[PDB]
Amino acid sequence: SMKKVSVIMPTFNNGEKLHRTISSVLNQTMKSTDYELIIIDDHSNDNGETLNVIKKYKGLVRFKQLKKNSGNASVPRNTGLKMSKAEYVFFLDSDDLLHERALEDLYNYGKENNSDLIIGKYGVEGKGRSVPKAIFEKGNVAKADIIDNSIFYALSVLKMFKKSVIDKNKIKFKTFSKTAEDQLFTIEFLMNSKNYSIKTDYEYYIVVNDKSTGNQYFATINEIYKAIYKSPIYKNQEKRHQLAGKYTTRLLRHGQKKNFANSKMKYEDKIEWLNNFSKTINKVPRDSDKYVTQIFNLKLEAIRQNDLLAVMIADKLL
Amino acid sequence: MKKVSVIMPTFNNGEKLHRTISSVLNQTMKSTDYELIIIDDHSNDNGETLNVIKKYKGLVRFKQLKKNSGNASVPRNTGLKMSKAEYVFFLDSDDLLHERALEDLYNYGKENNSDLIIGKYGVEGKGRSVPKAIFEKGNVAKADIIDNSIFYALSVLKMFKKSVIDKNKIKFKTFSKTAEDQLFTIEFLMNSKNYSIKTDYEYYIVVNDFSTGNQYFATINEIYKAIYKSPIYKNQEKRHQLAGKYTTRLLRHGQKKNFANSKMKYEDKIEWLNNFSKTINKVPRDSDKYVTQIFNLKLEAIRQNDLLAVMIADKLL
Amino acid sequence: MKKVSVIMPTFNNGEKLHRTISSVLNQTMKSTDYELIIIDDHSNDNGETLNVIKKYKGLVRFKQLKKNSGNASVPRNTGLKMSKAEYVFFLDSDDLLHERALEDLYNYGKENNSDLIIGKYGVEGKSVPKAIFEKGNVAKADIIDNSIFYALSVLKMFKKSVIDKNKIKFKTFSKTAEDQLFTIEFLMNSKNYSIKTDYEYYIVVNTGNQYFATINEIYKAIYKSPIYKNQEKRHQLAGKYTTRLLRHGQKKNFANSKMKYEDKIEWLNNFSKTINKVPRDSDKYVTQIFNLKLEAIRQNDLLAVMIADKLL
Ligand SMILES: O=P(O)(O)OC[C@H](O)[C@H](O)[C@H](O)COP(=O)(O)OC[C@H](O)[C@H](O)[C@H](O)COP(=O)(O)OC[C@@H](O)[C@@H](O)[C@@H](O)CO
Ligand SMILES: O=P(O)(O)OC[C@H](O)[C@H](O)[C@H](O)COP(=O)(O)OC[C@H](O)[C@H](O)[C@H](O)COP(=O)(O)OC[C@@H](O)[C@@H](O)[C@@H](O)CO
Ligand SMILES: O=P(O)(O)OC[C@H](O)[C@H](O)[C@H](O)COP(=O)(O)OC[C@H](O)[C@H](O)[C@H](O)COP(=O)(O)OC[C@@H](O)[C@@H](O)[C@@H](O)CO
Ligand SMILES: [Cl-]
Ligand SMILES: [Cl-]
Ligand SMILES: [Cl-]
Ligand SMILES: [Cl-]
Ligand SMILES: [Cl-]
Ligand SMILES: [Cl-]
Ligand SMILES: [Mg+2]
């Protein structure tokens, strides 16, 4: 009666490309009655092209049309979560492909290892969006560790999540920012679960490529640090410092506008951006700083001091 | 009306002046089509300089200033008042003109309706450097300040159309001992459109032989004022681009560019940086994106008036 | 009156002390011309150290402090009060004298009317000054030309009259740099310094509030010197000391270290307060590679010190 997996896919003005994606979900080795594809269209306005593609699969998919374009994937994904009563959910971007053995292999690995989270190796088609690599370099891992398995470098929601963890902890995608909302979701999930699995037999998920003040972005980063320091799984304060320090390293290596200081950004926007970054990082205990990779020691201290010249210099030395 | 007035200030040049005066009198241009105006800034070398000039009585126009002005500005202004020619050419007392300089530059200017003609510079000896990049594309009939590196050749050792100087009342200032020639060329560039570059010969040979910044930065301030008030370059974004290019030139070749890590007394470094900071902070930040990016930190350090940051910026350059 | 008093503080040295005491008793100098004064800083090693010293009863002068002072200053001051010799020589409890150390240094000092004689240092195990000894013997040395600010240990022969007349005592402000302060006070109150390099005469055997209070006293000693009265000469000496402090000072690389942020700020604050009492006229005598680091410390700017260290 209860499905193994709910695949949740937001759509917006995808057009004829959506065929390839929907086909990748319908052609799974997993029994077709054991899973569902939930499509949530974020009020496509492409002269019905996207709706016409979805109408060809009526009765093979669950479908909901939002009355207004929300602007990001958070509202559609939350709609999908409310609609799913499956054991696991898997979030899929509308332009991406699943390997034919993705749902079966990931579910089976998860069930065998009582996993709250299963991460399948990502492949990529074309230049653009990059995919994590370090997380998959140790082959299959049944009981993975956030730090040892580089999970803070793979925080997309393009993964298999146990629904009971999402329901019990009332984990929803937040809508206060256009960026990093998927990171916050995965962090909230990681901080409320213990069992993480990594499957690398195939490229199970293929990513297909074809002036912010920072008030909203750093509000999201603030929530990530809050999630770590309030974790009911990682309760030891020193363990929280280590996790926070590892996130700080990831943020300085891969964060939005990481090289803003020496950029062509207007001075007043640099000041506002650094002010938000500084305010957010200064709510993070300095005890975390010793867990940050040492090359970033000056840059991190420059941000804490809210000193644009020092950040500019730090970046020139990196 | 003469084609060209060559204007040459003198001061205690002595016997070396023969070579220079001879280079002007030996031109391919018809000798009745141009004049050499010599303005002596009250030489006091026991009449040696005056004795050299007296050998060309009747062949040059000459004026003796009653007192040494201290810089070339007053003599050059005197020369401008004395000239009624179509073009003026400023010559330094120790330098040489190629025999085809006046004819080739004038002809190129007349053919291209040029307000400004720049002849390729040669140099003899170490000391004063000369621009090179401006001459690397050969002859250019309608040059562009940015594309032809004109902000890297701001000497007045050029042929200027007199009507532009007269209509816009362009005079050399006496605010400072340095960069007054730059200000003059900038004022001229911002009030004219047609610039020509001639590279067939080394037309002008520079010959080498041998403090608080209040006055210098007052002159730099006037250069930025000239750019942002230009009746030729009226588009505000074009002004930002020009101002950014000047900022780059100032950081690459300005007076005391490496003051921060120098043996200058701390208190003098602070006063110098304070004048630099005050001047640059009157320039819109919109210009900063047009500055060559290696200087991004040094420029921001100067805007913040932060000596430590300028010292660090210089160590990283 | 003895030629030399060797002053040796002890604390929990144990059986190793035999080798040191033997090196002092086996000198080419007539044994009646010198004395070894041992001041134990209340050793608590089950009497092991006292048992070693008791084997030389009648061959050494000995005093036991009632309480461990924590630093060599109190024991060395006790030794100074006990000595009536022409010269004193301070010896660390684990170190060795060459057999010709007292004789050769004393003779060189007497022949050159030296207030201070410095014998070449050797080392056993995993440092000692080198530049001071690179010109061979120097009868009338110069602080700057002979790199004396790079050899400020008290492991030297000092004329006692200079110590007595100027009331020079080891201070107890800090556990560190008290020997430097003593040698600086001595140098600033004397003229005749000698360097002897014939042998390795001496073998070394292997809070910032308090430390910078001591560094402050070193600068005070230079700027109050009755020997070096010329203000420009004081600036040169102060600048040379600043160079030595940046090259060899305690926690020289604190800024990029694993020190807690709040301790870095307190340390730099003390360093800044101390250096800002030193005239900026001295800065031009500091080796130019340190120009940014020195200015960073004067500005009390942790980020700039961190950057300065990354560029050094
Ligand atoms: O020894 P440390 O910790 O200093 O160094 C870490 C390792 O050297 C690590 O292996 C490297 O960082 C290289 O990692 P990688 O090659 O395995 O991963 C590359 C990036 O993590 C990845 O391309 C991006 O960061 C994408 O990040 P995601 O966590 O997958 O999702 C974030 C993204 O969806 C979005 O929320 C944000 O990009 C919006 O700002
Ligand atoms: O602009 P960017 O950042 O993309 O790159 C610049 C290029 O690398 C370019 O090729 C060069 O910088 C251009 O320099 P150059 O090789 O043509 O040499 C020209 C120099 O600017 C020249 O040596 C002098 O620095 C410029 O002196 P003047 O323009 O003749 O100034 C008049 C001078 O007598 C006087 O105003 C100053 O002595 C008063 O300080
Ligand atoms: O930059 P300049 O031109 O002025 O010269 C730098 C040259 O490189 C110079 O020749 C060297 O610094 C000379 O050094 P060195 O090779 O003769 O000796 C190295 C150090 O001086 C030496 O390792 C220690 O600094 C010795 O310190 P002490 O003067 O014996 O201090 C006493 C010490 O027990 C104590 O006070 C310290 O532990 C204080 O924390
Ligand atoms: Cl972990
Ligand atoms: Cl934002
Ligand atoms: Cl908060
Ligand atoms: Cl824990
Ligand atoms: Cl991010
Ligand atoms: Cl000038
Ligand atoms: Mg700074």
Tab-separated table of N, CA and C in Angstrom, chain A residues 128-240:
chain	number	residue	atom	x	y	z
A	128	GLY	N	29.076	23.874	-17.099
A	128	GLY	CA	28.133	24.674	-16.292
A	128	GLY	C	28.189	24.267	-14.826
A	129	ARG	N	27.058	23.799	-14.278
A	129	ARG	CA	26.965	23.179	-12.930
A	129	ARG	C	28.031	22.079	-12.817
A	130	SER	N	28.853	22.122	-11.761
A	130	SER	CA	29.843	21.068	-11.422
A	130	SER	C	29.192	20.084	-10.442
A	131	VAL	N	29.772	18.893	-10.260
A	131	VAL	CA	29.220	17.890	-9.299
A	131	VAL	C	30.314	17.467	-8.323
A	132	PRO	N	29.944	17.086	-7.079
A	132	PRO	CA	30.915	16.609	-6.101
A	132	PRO	C	31.619	15.339	-6.591
A	133	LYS	N	32.866	15.158	-6.153
A	133	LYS	CA	33.740	14.031	-6.560
A	133	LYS	C	34.317	13.346	-5.312
A	134	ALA	N	34.791	14.104	-4.319
A	134	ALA	CA	35.556	13.554	-3.174
A	134	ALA	C	34.690	12.554	-2.402
A	135	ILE	N	33.407	12.851	-2.232
A	135	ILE	CA	32.446	11.971	-1.508
A	135	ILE	C	32.418	10.563	-2.124
A	136	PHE	N	32.704	10.401	-3.416
A	136	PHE	CA	32.561	9.101	-4.138
A	136	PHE	C	33.910	8.399	-4.318
A	137	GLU	N	34.993	8.949	-3.765
A	137	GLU	CA	36.369	8.478	-4.048
A	137	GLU	C	36.724	7.262	-3.183
A	138	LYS	N	35.890	6.863	-2.224
A	138	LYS	CA	36.193	5.696	-1.342
A	138	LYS	C	35.299	4.509	-1.716
A	139	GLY	N	34.629	4.577	-2.865
A	139	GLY	CA	33.632	3.574	-3.287
A	139	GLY	C	32.416	3.571	-2.376
A	140	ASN	N	31.730	2.433	-2.278
A	140	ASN	CA	30.501	2.303	-1.465
A	140	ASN	C	30.861	2.457	0.008
A	141	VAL	N	30.058	3.230	0.736
A	141	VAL	CA	30.197	3.435	2.201
A	141	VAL	C	28.812	3.253	2.820
A	142	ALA	N	28.677	2.257	3.689
A	142	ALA	CA	27.390	1.864	4.289
A	142	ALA	C	27.030	2.817	5.432
A	143	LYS	N	28.023	3.203	6.237
A	143	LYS	CA	27.857	4.129	7.393
A	143	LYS	C	28.861	5.271	7.228
A	144	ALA	N	28.486	6.298	6.487
A	144	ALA	CA	29.372	7.420	6.120
A	144	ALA	C	29.423	8.435	7.265
A	145	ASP	N	30.456	9.261	7.240
A	145	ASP	CA	30.738	10.305	8.255
A	145	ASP	C	30.813	11.634	7.520
A	146	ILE	N	30.154	12.647	8.056
A	146	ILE	CA	30.045	13.975	7.397
A	146	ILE	C	31.452	14.438	7.002
A	147	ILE	N	32.398	14.409	7.934
A	147	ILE	CA	33.744	15.004	7.723
A	147	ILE	C	34.599	14.048	6.885
A	148	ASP	N	34.680	12.774	7.255
A	148	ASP	CA	35.598	11.812	6.595
A	148	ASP	C	35.145	11.540	5.150
A	149	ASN	N	33.858	11.726	4.828
A	149	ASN	CA	33.317	11.379	3.493
A	149	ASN	C	32.878	12.646	2.751
A	150	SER	N	33.312	13.818	3.202
A	150	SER	CA	33.200	15.090	2.444
A	150	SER	C	31.735	15.396	2.122
A	151	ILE	N	30.812	15.128	3.041
A	151	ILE	CA	29.359	15.287	2.801
A	151	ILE	C	29.015	16.784	2.761
A	152	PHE	N	29.753	17.652	3.455
A	152	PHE	CA	29.516	19.115	3.427
A	152	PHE	C	29.900	19.686	2.047
A	153	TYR	N	30.528	18.897	1.182
A	153	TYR	CA	30.864	19.292	-0.205
A	153	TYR	C	29.839	18.702	-1.198
A	154	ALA	N	28.763	18.079	-0.712
A	154	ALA	CA	27.697	17.500	-1.566
A	154	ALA	C	26.342	17.713	-0.902
A	155	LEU	N	25.923	18.978	-0.763
A	155	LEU	CA	24.739	19.329	0.062
A	155	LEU	C	23.503	19.538	-0.819
A	156	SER	N	23.517	19.128	-2.092
A	156	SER	CA	22.295	19.179	-2.944
A	156	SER	C	21.246	18.233	-2.339
A	157	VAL	N	19.971	18.413	-2.672
A	157	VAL	CA	18.909	17.487	-2.207
A	157	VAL	C	18.659	16.415	-3.277
A	158	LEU	N	19.589	16.214	-4.208
A	158	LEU	CA	19.450	15.206	-5.291
A	158	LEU	C	19.904	13.857	-4.718
A	159	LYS	N	19.147	13.390	-3.734
A	159	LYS	CA	19.507	12.250	-2.855
A	159	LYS	C	18.229	11.545	-2.418
A	160	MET	N	18.366	10.368	-1.827
A	160	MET	CA	17.226	9.609	-1.270
A	160	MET	C	17.187	9.860	0.246
A	161	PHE	N	16.142	10.542	0.714
A	161	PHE	CA	15.908	10.890	2.137
A	161	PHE	C	14.783	10.041	2.729
A	162	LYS	N	14.981	9.494	3.932
A	162	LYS	CA	13.922	8.763	4.670
A	162	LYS	C	12.850	9.771	5.098
A	163	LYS	N	11.597	9.528	4.714
A	163	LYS	CA	10.483	10.480	4.909
A	163	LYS	C	10.182	10.643	6.405
A	164	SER	N	10.345	9.596	7.207
A	164	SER	CA	9.992	9.645	8.653
A	164	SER	C	10.842	10.713	9.359
A	165	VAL	N	12.097	10.881	8.939
A	165	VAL	CA	13.000	11.900	9.536
A	165	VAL	C	12.459	13.291	9.209
A	166	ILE	N	12.033	13.498	7.960
A	166	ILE	CA	11.451	14.783	7.469
A	166	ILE	C	10.161	15.080	8.246
A	167	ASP	N	9.293	14.079	8.401
A	167	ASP	CA	7.967	14.235	9.063
A	167	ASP	C	8.155	14.493	10.561
A	168	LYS	N	8.916	13.646	11.260
A	168	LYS	CA	9.084	13.728	12.742
A	168	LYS	C	9.687	15.091	13.108
A	169	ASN	N	10.622	15.603	12.305
A	169	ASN	CA	11.385	16.837	12.620
A	169	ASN	C	10.782	18.028	11.864
A	170	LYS	N	9.713	17.811	11.102
A	170	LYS	CA	8.983	18.889	10.375
A	170	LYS	C	9.996	19.696	9.552
A	171	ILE	N	10.816	19.005	8.758
A	171	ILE	CA	11.846	19.640	7.889
A	171	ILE	C	11.158	20.073	6.598
A	172	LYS	N	11.178	21.370	6.320
A	172	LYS	CA	10.608	21.989	5.096
A	172	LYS	C	11.702	22.826	4.438
A	173	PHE	N	11.639	23.001	3.121
A	173	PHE	CA	12.498	23.964	2.398
A	173	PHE	C	12.055	25.370	2.810
A	174	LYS	N	13.008	26.252	3.115
A	174	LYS	CA	12.678	27.650	3.505
A	174	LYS	C	12.654	28.520	2.250
A	175	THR	N	11.971	29.659	2.340
A	175	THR	CA	11.639	30.501	1.154
A	175	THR	C	12.186	31.922	1.349
A	176	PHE	N	12.995	32.172	2.401
A	176	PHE	CA	13.532	33.527	2.679
A	176	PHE	C	14.699	33.776	1.739
A	177	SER	N	15.237	32.831	0.954
A	177	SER	CA	16.384	33.093	0.042
A	177	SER	C	16.236	32.294	-1.254
A	178	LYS	N	16.836	32.774	-2.342
A	178	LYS	CA	16.695	32.165	-3.702
A	178	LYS	C	17.770	31.092	-3.863
A	179	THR	N	18.783	31.121	-2.994
A	179	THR	CA	20.010	30.282	-3.101
A	179	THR	C	20.264	29.588	-1.754
A	180	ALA	N	20.904	28.421	-1.765
A	180	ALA	CA	21.415	27.678	-0.582
A	180	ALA	C	20.272	27.085	0.261
A	181	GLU	N	19.033	27.066	-0.230
A	181	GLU	CA	17.874	26.522	0.514
A	181	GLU	C	17.967	24.996	0.516
A	182	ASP	N	18.520	24.416	-0.549
A	182	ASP	CA	18.780	22.961	-0.645
A	182	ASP	C	19.868	22.576	0.374
A	183	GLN	N	20.922	23.376	0.506
A	183	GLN	CA	22.003	23.142	1.506
A	183	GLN	C	21.386	23.091	2.910
A	184	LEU	N	20.556	24.085	3.241
A	184	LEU	CA	19.928	24.195	4.574
A	184	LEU	C	19.113	22.926	4.845
A	185	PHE	N	18.366	22.473	3.843
A	185	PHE	CA	17.494	21.286	3.974
A	185	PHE	C	18.359	20.066	4.295
A	186	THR	N	19.398	19.824	3.501
A	186	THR	CA	20.308	18.665	3.693
A	186	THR	C	20.996	18.778	5.057
A	187	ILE	N	21.414	19.974	5.451
A	187	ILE	CA	22.092	20.172	6.767
A	187	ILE	C	21.086	19.839	7.870
A	188	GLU	N	19.865	20.360	7.795
A	188	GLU	CA	18.825	20.098	8.833
A	188	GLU	C	18.617	18.586	8.915
A	189	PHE	N	18.597	17.912	7.778
A	189	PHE	CA	18.365	16.455	7.712
A	189	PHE	C	19.545	15.719	8.361
A	190	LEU	N	20.776	16.083	7.980
A	190	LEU	CA	22.018	15.464	8.492
A	190	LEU	C	22.073	15.631	10.017
A	191	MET	N	21.690	16.797	10.527
A	191	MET	CA	21.767	17.104	11.970
A	191	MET	C	20.640	16.395	12.732
A	192	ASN	N	19.704	15.738	12.045
A	192	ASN	CA	18.566	15.042	12.705
A	192	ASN	C	18.567	13.557	12.337
A	193	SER	N	19.682	13.022	11.841
A	193	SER	CA	19.788	11.592	11.446
A	193	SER	C	21.228	11.117	11.629
A	194	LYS	N	21.467	9.809	11.616
A	194	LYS	CA	22.806	9.220	11.898
A	194	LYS	C	23.309	8.395	10.714
A	195	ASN	N	22.412	7.733	9.983
A	195	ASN	CA	22.795	6.659	9.032
A	195	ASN	C	22.817	7.245	7.619
A	196	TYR	N	24.007	7.418	7.060
A	196	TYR	CA	24.226	7.952	5.702
A	196	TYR	C	24.979	6.903	4.890
A	197	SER	N	24.560	6.697	3.649
A	197	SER	CA	25.143	5.687	2.738
A	197	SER	C	25.540	6.370	1.436
A	198	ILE	N	26.616	5.895	0.828
A	198	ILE	CA	27.147	6.399	-0.462
A	198	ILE	C	27.257	5.207	-1.416
A	199	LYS	N	26.614	5.301	-2.575
A	199	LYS	CA	26.594	4.234	-3.604
A	199	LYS	C	27.254	4.775	-4.868
A	200	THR	N	28.245	4.067	-5.401
A	200	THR	CA	29.115	4.579	-6.495
A	200	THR	C	29.221	3.585	-7.661
A	201	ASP	N	28.390	2.543	-7.695
A	201	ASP	CA	28.463	1.475	-8.735
A	201	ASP	C	28.240	2.095	-10.122
A	202	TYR	N	27.330	3.056	-10.227
A	202	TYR	CA	26.979	3.759	-11.487
A	202	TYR	C	26.889	5.264	-11.237
A	203	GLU	N	26.967	6.048	-12.311
A	203	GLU	CA	26.497	7.456	-12.317
A	203	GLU	C	24.969	7.416	-12.233
A	204	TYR	N	24.431	7.362	-11.012
A	204	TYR	CA	22.996	7.102	-10.737
A	204	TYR	C	22.148	8.329	-11.087
A	205	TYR	N	22.719	9.526	-10.953
A	205	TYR	CA	22.039	10.821	-11.212
A	205	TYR	C	22.934	11.627	-12.143
A	206	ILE	N	22.416	12.015	-13.304
A	206	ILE	CA	23.178	12.819	-14.300
A	206	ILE	C	22.638	14.245	-14.287
A	207	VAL	N	23.451	15.195	-13.836
A	207	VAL	CA	23.167	16.652	-13.969
A	207	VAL	C	23.381	17.041	-15.432
A	208	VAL	N	22.354	17.568	-16.088
A	208	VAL	CA	22.427	17.984	-17.516
A	208	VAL	C	22.466	19.514	-17.573
A	209	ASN	N	23.565	20.072	-18.080
A	209	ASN	CA	23.721	21.527	-18.359
A	209	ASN	C	23.173	21.844	-19.759
A	210	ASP	N	22.450	22.951	-19.913
A	210	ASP	CA	22.042	23.470	-21.253
A	210	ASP	C	21.931	25.001	-21.244
A	211	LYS	N	22.209	41.980	-8.462
A	211	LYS	CA	23.116	42.575	-7.451
A	211	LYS	C	22.533	42.325	-6.056
A	212	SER	N	22.881	41.178	-5.456
A	212	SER	CA	22.448	40.739	-4.099
A	212	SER	C	23.236	41.488	-3.008
A	213	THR	N	22.508	41.925	-1.984
A	213	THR	CA	23.012	42.578	-0.738
A	213	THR	C	23.583	41.509	0.209
A	214	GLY	N	23.079	40.270	0.111
A	214	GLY	CA	23.483	39.143	0.964
A	214	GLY	C	22.624	39.025	2.208
A	215	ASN	N	21.607	39.873	2.391
A	215	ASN	CA	20.721	39.805	3.577
A	215	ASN	C	20.062	38.425	3.611
A	216	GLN	N	19.578	37.934	2.472
A	216	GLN	CA	18.782	36.683	2.404
A	216	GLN	C	19.734	35.480	2.429
A	217	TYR	N	20.795	35.534	1.640
A	217	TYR	CA	21.804	34.454	1.556
A	217	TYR	C	22.391	34.179	2.952
A	218	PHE	N	22.824	35.213	3.663
A	218	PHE	CA	23.517	35.046	4.972
A	218	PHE	C	22.496	34.685	6.053
A	219	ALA	N	21.207	34.982	5.852
A	219	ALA	CA	20.128	34.503	6.749
A	219	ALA	C	20.047	32.982	6.647
A	220	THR	N	20.242	32.449	5.451
A	220	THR	CA	20.235	30.992	5.181
A	220	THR	C	21.498	30.375	5.791
A	221	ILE	N	22.651	31.021	5.627
A	221	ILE	CA	23.939	30.511	6.175
A	221	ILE	C	23.822	30.494	7.698
A	222	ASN	N	23.207	31.523	8.268
A	222	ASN	CA	22.975	31.621	9.721
A	222	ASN	C	22.163	30.414	10.178
A	223	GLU	N	21.155	29.993	9.413
A	223	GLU	CA	20.273	28.853	9.771
A	223	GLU	C	21.069	27.553	9.735
A	224	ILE	N	22.037	27.437	8.838
A	224	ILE	CA	22.887	26.216	8.726
A	224	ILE	C	23.694	26.091	10.021
A	225	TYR	N	24.323	27.172	10.473
A	225	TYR	CA	25.111	27.165	11.728
A	225	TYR	C	24.173	26.868	12.900
A	226	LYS	N	22.987	27.461	12.921
A	226	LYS	CA	21.961	27.211	13.977
A	226	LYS	C	21.631	25.715	14.006
A	227	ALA	N	21.451	25.097	12.852
A	227	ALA	CA	21.061	23.669	12.737
A	227	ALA	C	22.163	22.802	13.354
A	228	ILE	N	23.426	23.162	13.116
A	228	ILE	CA	24.596	22.381	13.615
A	228	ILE	C	24.625	22.504	15.138
A	229	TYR	N	24.497	23.717	15.672
A	229	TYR	CA	24.683	23.999	17.115
A	229	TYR	C	23.440	23.593	17.911
A	230	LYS	N	22.336	23.210	17.271
A	230	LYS	CA	21.098	22.751	17.964
A	230	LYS	C	20.870	21.263	17.678
A	231	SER	N	21.818	20.582	17.040
A	231	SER	CA	21.646	19.182	16.580
A	231	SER	C	21.376	18.273	17.766
A	232	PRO	N	20.258	17.516	17.755
A	232	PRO	CA	20.017	16.487	18.762
A	232	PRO	C	20.818	15.194	18.531
A	233	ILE	N	21.467	15.044	17.383
A	233	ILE	CA	22.355	13.881	17.067
A	233	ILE	C	23.773	14.225	17.512
A	234	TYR	N	24.302	15.364	17.060
A	234	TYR	CA	25.664	15.834	17.398
A	234	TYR	C	25.544	16.823	18.560
A	235	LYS	N	25.457	16.291	19.785
A	235	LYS	CA	25.138	17.053	21.019
A	235	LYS	C	26.429	17.588	21.633
A	236	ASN	N	27.551	16.922	21.407
A	236	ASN	CA	28.839	17.327	22.027
A	236	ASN	C	29.248	18.674	21.415
A	237	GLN	N	29.520	19.657	22.263
A	237	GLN	CA	29.816	21.043	21.829
A	237	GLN	C	31.074	21.048	20.954
A	238	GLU	N	32.077	20.244	21.276
A	238	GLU	CA	33.350	20.234	20.505
A	238	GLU	C	33.068	19.644	19.122
A	239	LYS	N	32.150	18.685	19.031
A	239	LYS	CA	31.793	18.052	17.745
A	239	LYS	C	31.080	19.099	16.880
A	240	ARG	N	30.229	19.916	17.499
A	240	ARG	CA	29.549	21.032	16.822
A	240	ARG	C	30.594	22.012	16.288
